[PDB]
Each structure stands twice: as C-alpha cells, then as structure tokens.
C-alpha cells in the first residue's frame, strides 16, 4: 500500500543478490534531518525475462499480505523507472543472515534452538496463508536481535493451487538443489513437506554455525565428486534414495539429529509439519536452556 518516492532514498551500501534480485540498504530521509530510517531494497534486475517480471509482482503482493513476528516487514513499494517494474522496501535487519552472522558469533545450543522454533512459527504461518518458501536456507533467515529471527526472502515463494497438494517447478539453473527434496529434484513437485526438508538442512546449517566447510553444497560435492558433467543432481538424487544424508554436526545433540533425519523423511508424507514441530522444538528449548 505504502509508496516510496525515489527523491527521499539515499543508496548507502549493498546488502545482497539472490536469484533474480538485489537488495540494497537504503536512508529515507524526508528532510535532511535526524528523524531519518534506514531501508533494505530489493530490485529486479532490468534485464530480467518476462517470467521473473510476473513472479516479481506475485512476490511484492505477497509480501504485502504476509504479516507476522517472524516474516521481514514490508514497507512499501516506490517506482524503479530504470527498471519500469517495481522496488519493493522493507525494513533493514543490521545483523543481517544467519549465514553471515554465526560464522563470527558463537551462539549457544539454546539460542539456535530457539531461532529453530521462530523459523518452524514463521513457516507455519506462511503455510497457513497457502504459500510455499521454495527457498529456506540460513542465508534467507535474518537476526534482528540475539532472541528474534524473521524469514527474509520470499523470491521463490508461490501460491499453491486450492485442489492441488503440490505446485509444479520446472526446474531452473539457479534452484537451490542442495536444500531440495528428492521429490523435488525427482518429480518437478514441491509440496508443503518439502519446506520441511529445507527446514532440516536450515537446521544442520544452524548446528554448524554457517561453517562454509561443513555447508550444504560443500558437503554434497564431496559425496558426489566435480567431475560429473550433466549429472550432479542425478547423483545427489541417487545418494538421497540410498539413504545418505548430512553428517551430524560436531557438538549437535544426538535428539536435535534424530528430528533433523526425521525432516529428511524420503517419503513426503513421513516428514513431520510445521505445525507439528512447534511443540517439540518448543519442548526441545526448554530443555538445553537449563
Ligand atoms: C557483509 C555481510 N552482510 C551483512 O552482515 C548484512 C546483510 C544484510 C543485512 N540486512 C538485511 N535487511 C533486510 C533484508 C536483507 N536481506 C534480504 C535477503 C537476505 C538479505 C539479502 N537478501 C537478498 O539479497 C535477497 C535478494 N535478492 N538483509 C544486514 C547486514
């Protein structure tokens, strides 16, 4: 609803690039004066293709309906006339991702567990809006404070049809495979459990701290190899059917684990919700807290 007017915005650094877009920290500043807030803007690029054009204004609309504690805040919207589409302006997190975050704080069992339960209740809700993420990864899941974590990127996120249980994909170049699950890598099918896998690897990536060594592509491609042609995820498919999985972090409770594998259910269906791991993180945080 809101609108921006590009006269007020002063461009202060970049924050990001993610699959079709970029966003940038923005001031908005309608003086001069001290009374100042400071934006995070995301921006299509100009040269995108008419598929990403009609995504971009399905993914603004949905950001301005999504509205809870643990989903970014929109802001507004403001006319990209480079771009002839849209910005879409939210509110800046300045301790941005997870991914970029933990690597230099050593953050405790507890907290991590707690950042877990906050993205299962902000996953849930989105779920409950009939929406799937597509895309859950410590890189899309922003630290606004040491207690308060919000899903930040809705750029894959899509509506799924009213009869349908899955949406069809089609899979592109910049699919984040090594966050998928077989179904999705296999079928072109993403369903409301296959968030739940990508929730499972949003978690071993939690347990690691964000290590780039230990991350999920790194430790795919060792399983895999480099010398594969084509075939990369024709071999993380196999691999995820013969039952292998991602090692158990260093210093990960062997329960935390056992949920995480659970999330990683071959079989769809066998994979818990959302809804459903609330109170068991919930349970599992109380616990590591004393
Ligand atoms: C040098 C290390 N950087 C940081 O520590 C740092 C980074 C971001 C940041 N604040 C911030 N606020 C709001 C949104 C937002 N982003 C939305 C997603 C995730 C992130 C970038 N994204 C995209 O680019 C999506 C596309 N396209 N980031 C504050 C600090």
């Given at each position: ?128 809006q009939?929406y ?64 739940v ?14 290590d ?14 480099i ?28 329960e ?35």
């Amino acid at each position: 609803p809101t609108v921006f007017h590009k006269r007020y915005l002063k461009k202060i650094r970049d924050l990001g690039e993610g699959h079709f877009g970029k966003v940038s920290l923005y001031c908005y500043d309608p003086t001069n004066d001290g009374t100042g807030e400071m934006v995070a803007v995301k921006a299509l690029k100009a040269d995108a293709g008419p598929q990403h054009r009609s995504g971009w204004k399905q993914e603004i609309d949905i950001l301005r309906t999504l509205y809870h504690e643990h989903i970014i805040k929109y802001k507004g919207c403001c006319e990209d006339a480079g771009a002839a589409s849209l910005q879409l302006v939210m509110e800046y997190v300045p301790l941005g991702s997870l991914r970029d975050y933990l690597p230099r704080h050593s953050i405790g069992l507890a907290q991590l567990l707690l950042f877990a339960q906050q993205i299962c209740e902000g996953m849930a809700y989105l779920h409950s809006q009939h929406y799937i993420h597509r895309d859950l990864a410590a890189r899309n899941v922003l630290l606004d404070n040491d207690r308060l974590v919000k899903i930040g990127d809705f750029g894959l996120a899509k509506a799924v049809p009213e009869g349908h249980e899955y949406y069809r994909v089609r899979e592109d170049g910049d699919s984040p495979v090594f966050w998928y699950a077989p179904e999705c890598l296999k079928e072109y099918k993403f369903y409301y459990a296959s968030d739940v896998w990508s929730f499972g690897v949003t978690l071993y990536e939690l347990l690691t701290h964000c290590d780039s060594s230990q991350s999920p592509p790194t430790k795919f491609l060792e399983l895999i190899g480099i010398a594969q042609g084509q075939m990369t995820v024709l071999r993380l498919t196999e691999l995820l059917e013969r039952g292998e999985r991602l090692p158990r972090p260093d210093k990960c409770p062997a329960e935390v684990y056992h949920l995480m594998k659970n999330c990683w259910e071959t079989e769809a269906s066998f994979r818990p919700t959302f809804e459903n791991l609330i109170p068991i993180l919930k349970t599992v945080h109380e616990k590591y807290q004393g």
